[PDB]
Amino acid sequence: VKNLYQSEKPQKWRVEIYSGQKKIKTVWQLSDSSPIDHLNFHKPDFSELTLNGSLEERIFFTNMVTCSQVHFK
Amino acid sequence: CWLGAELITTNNSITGIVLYVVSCKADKNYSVNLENLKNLHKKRHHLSTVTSKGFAQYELFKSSALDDTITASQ
Amino acid sequence: MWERLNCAAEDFYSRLLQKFNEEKKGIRKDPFLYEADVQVQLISKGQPNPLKNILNENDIVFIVEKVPLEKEET
Amino acid sequence: WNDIELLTNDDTGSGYLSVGSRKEHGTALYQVDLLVKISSEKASLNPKIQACSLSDGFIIVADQSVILLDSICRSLQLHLVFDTEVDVVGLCQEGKFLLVGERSGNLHLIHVTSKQTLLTNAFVQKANDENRRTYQNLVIEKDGSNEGTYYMLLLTYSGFFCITNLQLLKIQQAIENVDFSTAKKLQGQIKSSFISTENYHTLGCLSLVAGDLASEVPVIIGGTGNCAFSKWEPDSSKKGMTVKNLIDAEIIKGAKKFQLIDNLLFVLDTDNVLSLWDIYTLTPVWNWPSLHVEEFLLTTEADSPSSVTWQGITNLKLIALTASANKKMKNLMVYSLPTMEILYSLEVSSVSSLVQTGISTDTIYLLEGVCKNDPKLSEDSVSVLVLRCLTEALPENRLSRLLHKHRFAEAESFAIQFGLDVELVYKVKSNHILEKLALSSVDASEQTEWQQLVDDAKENLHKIQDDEFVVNYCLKAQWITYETTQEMLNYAKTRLLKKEDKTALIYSDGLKEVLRAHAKLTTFYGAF
Amino acid sequence: LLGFNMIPYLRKVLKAISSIHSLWQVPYFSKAWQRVIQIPLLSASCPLSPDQLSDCSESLIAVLECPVSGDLDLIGVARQYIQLELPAFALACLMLMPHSEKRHQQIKNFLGSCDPQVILKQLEEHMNTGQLAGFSHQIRSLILNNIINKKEFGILAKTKYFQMLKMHAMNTNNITELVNYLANDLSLDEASVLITEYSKHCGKPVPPDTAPCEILKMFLSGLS
Q1: Chain A window 5-44: which residues touch B at a Cβ cutoff of 8 Å?
Q2: D170, D112 in Cβ contact below 8 A?
Q3: What is the three-state SS of D423-481?
Q4: What subcellular compartments does it reside in (chain C)?
Q5: Residue D371 CB burial class (10 angstroms; 0-12, 13-18, ≥19)
Q6: Which residues pair with D322 in a beta bridge?
């Protein structure tokens, strides 16, 4: 199925950099759609905007999962 | 958009916690250095090694309908 | 500032532990109302997990959300 | 304050000036030394004292007399008496330039070695109050984009001055090479930009801290008003700093003092409560509400800013000025982060200030107000200013700051001097070099980097006579090549076999783990 | 037990106690392994009967099952297998040493005196059966890697293993020298098909209907 994802763009691409356990991680992810189920970032209002042979504008959603490690002793 | 809190468990003992801070950006341009991300991971939590796992979701097929979808089954 | 922090944290820990005990006994319930505008849902495998959109490594996790507000009547 | 007397470490065990009713509880490893003793002809009822110990020198700010000594505090460099009370001080250009910020709003650039007020500028023409300070913090930092140039953050009651183009190295050159016309021309080229915090800090900014993390310049300002915290970062597309993060005055109404060691923003609130914060996103990491710390000072044997990262959480010994139940007496505690174990307790007068030291000082400096023994004078009235130096001359107290800050070179000599355990220094250096070996991978350009560390680790293991520690280090060593791993496991097995030939084969955990590692030695090669 | 010459019973007892850490340090443990391994090998001689070959396999298993086999003289056992005309069995014992430099020297000196095709045939016929199947492929990987490193593609080129020598170039990414040998010393068709298969394997397929010289040119430009 290598010919199926070499002709399609990924709906989400994620890189996860971690050390040892996956409790502490840094994630950089790019999604063509909104990856948030409780918020919606402002896409341009396609009313009175481009309605011709030109393609519609697309805003890619990039999300950065960071964290802060606290030592409990 | 999300605030996470995951405990660091060593031998089923709470030796720490991971306070996740998930941010989201809406920008047409996407470009970042992997070395910069690895350095940020090394310098923010003061760990030694870095390993990068890659994930990708390629949507192959979605059931199309002659109307906006309401039914959960798809 | 003293009781409203420590006592609240302990009460929240007790509510979470009660939710785990209910989940492990085979009884899945609605997201319990810890506060008026806050409800906490213990999403496990068998329930939809929004965090899978950003992190595939979270399977059994509490999601704290605002209570879904219903429309007002006259 | 004009009567200056400079005393050395040999004058400490021959006389003291202090107020009675002092109780000390703790180990005798802490030594209090009397370095500087400044007596005044008039006993100030409530002097507004301040002291800062920079690498360029030591500044004592009295009501109106500024005393500038060297970092050792044994020679008199400068003594300036002004008619306006000085609020903030700061040294620059190896201590050859003094910036005096008077209460009226005038900044004086004065050459230290010539006693000449080279420049005087009224940066603010409005004196808000002659009893409360106008300038709050004076932070001088070295520019990384221009050679011989400084950038300077002046926190004011209505905002902050970002002053760049401080080409003070060339000003000093034009002082040495005698041409004062060019010196004045360069002084007139200084670029000052005021950024107002009147839209976010409506009650005046209290404290300012500046750092360099995440390839940015996080300037955290803590004040009272609409927003307690304001995080300013320089805009790469413009000339100035913009707000990046805001914390509302809901939980914490403001910050009185900051201290940023590394990725740790120790925030003192308006309630004299210390807390631990992560500067990356300003999340609550720790809080210290039990200790009413009026002022906190963090002192450690600093060798490099990256030394704290790799050795846990013992980095700093918190010197906290706790307010005890006595309304005449403050209590200096030494705590071990974060367990708050009382390592040292000293009773200090009501007028006593922790010296605002940098991240380059190794000793603790305290400005103490000692009143002369006179029943006609109250204890609050300070007649003598005494510089108290807290030195942990006895071992196992400086050694804690030695082994943590990756200072094995000095720690070896420290252990030799007191006849301590030198092998433990090698044991810690072995773990550090073990992680340094993990600082490399299978690359076509890093071959020599890990190879030299292999020899360093071999030398350290040869210097460590404890066989079990060497075997465990070998078993837990992270290697990048199979050849080296096999060779070092063979060496570990051989060392265990050699010692068992004379002890009738004493069973040890090292041999049991080495054998099972060898069982997985060939399995990993054949499988992956 | 060895005093009564019960070599197989002693082997069974040793393998029964090969899971206890206390008995691994018996002074006779490694001594018992060595004689039990060698006595059936010393008694055996060419030609190899099925019982003698099974006993050689049992000795190799005892080498495998021994947790302290690194303390045994594996060069001696390998030379005993050489006297049995079993280069594959000798290389199996040579590979299991815990010393890396001596192992590399001995393997390089050994494989340069034995025909790789015969060793691979012995690996296929006997080493791929029983419990030795998983280690035969690793011996084969060592042999093929040494062949590629020694520019000895011509030994297996006339046999059926050359195509196999092709696919091992796929898995270990050691195709540069094989491609050079095929393009220079042999026909360009085998080099072009080899590079096409390599491109298909790595997810960067070369488009078809391409001349072998052009495919070689893109392969050479792909190595820079």
Answers
A1: 5, 8-21, 23-26, 28, 30, 35-36, 38-39, 41-43
A2: no
A3: HHHHHHHHHHHHHHHHCCCCCCCCHHHHHHHHHHHHHHHHHCCCHHHHHHHHHCCCCCC
A4: Chromosome, Centromere, Kinetochore
A5: buried
A6: D293, D331
Question: Do the chains contact at D483 and E100, CB–CB below 8 Å?
Answer: yes
Alpha helices in D86-179 (DSSP H): 168-176
Give me the phi and psi of D285, to 5 degrees please. -100, -45
Q: CA of B31 to nearest chain A CA: how many angstroms apart? A: 10
In the 8-state DSSP scheme, what is residue E17?
Answer: T
Which SS3 state, helix, strand or coil, does residue E215 take? helix
State the Cα angle at D513 between D512 and D519, rounded to 5°: 95
D1 closest CA partner among D35, D49, D73: D49
Of B7, B21, B47, the CB nearest to A19: B47
Asked if residues E93 and E69 have their Cβ atoms less than 8 Å apart, the reply is no
DSSP letter for each residue of D356-371: ---SS--SEEEEEEE-
Who among D214, D281, D439 is closest to B40 (CB)? D214
Alpha carbon of D328 to those of D16, D22, D217, D384: distances in Å?
A: 20, 11, 41, 17
**Cα torsion for D1, D54, D287, D353, to the nearest 10°?**
-10
Q: E128: Cβ–Cβ under 8 A, 6 or more apart, which residues?
A: E136
Strand, coil or helix: what is D417? helix
- Rounded to 10 degrees, the C-alpha dihedral D3/D8/D11/D15 comes to 50
3-state secondary structure of D306: coil
Beta strands in chain A (DSSP E): 12-19, 21-31, 61-71
CB E147 within 8 A of CB E153: yes
Strand D65-69, strand D76-81: pairing: antiparallel
Structure solved via: cryo-EM
Residue E219, helix vs strand vs coil:
helix
Q: Please tell me the distance from the alpha carbon of residue D114 to that of residue D98, in angstroms, as a whole number.
A: 11
CB E15 within 8 A of CB E62: yes
- φ, ψ of residue D279 to 5 degrees: the values are -70, -20
What is d(CA D319, CA D346) in angstroms, rounded to the nearest whole number?
11
Length of chain A: 73
Laid out side by side, the sheet with D219-223 consists of D205-210, D219-223, D227-234, D241-248
User: Which amino acid, one-letter code, is at E72?
Assistant: L
Q: Note the resolution in Å, 1 decimal.
A: 3.9
**Nearest residue to D516 via CA among B71, E19, A45:** E19
Q: Do the beta carbons of residue C62 and residue C44 sit within 8 Å? A: no
Q: Which of E93, E24, E87 is nearest to E64 (CA)?
A: E93
Residue D108 half-sphere exposure toward CB, CA atoms < 13 A: 23
State whether residue D494 sits within 8 Å of chain E by CB: no
Q: Please report the number of interchain residue pairs, chain A to chain C, with beta-carbon separation below 8 angstroms.
A: 17
Q: What is the DSSP letter of D420?
A: -
For residue D162, give every residue at least 6 positions away whose Cβ sits within 8 Å of its Cβ, in sequence order, or none: D151, D152, D153, D192, D193, D194, D195, D240, D241
Residue B54 CB partners (closer than 8 Å, separation 6+): A13, A14, A15, A16
Q: Could you tell me if D34 and D7 are in contact, meaning their C-beta atoms sit under 8 angstroms apart?
A: yes
- Residue D334 near residue D342, CB atoms below 8 Å: yes
With tokens 């009224």, the residue in question is D122
Choose the mutation target among B2, B6, B17, B55 for the interface with C, i.e. most C CBs under 10 Å. B2
Written as six digits, the tokens of D337 are 């982060």
Please give the Cα distance from D115 to D98 (Å, whole number). 10
Alpha carbons E17 and E12: distance in angstroms, whole number: 9
Q: Spell out the alpha helix ranges (H) of D250-309.
A: none
Cβ under 8 Å to B: A residues 52-71 = 57-71
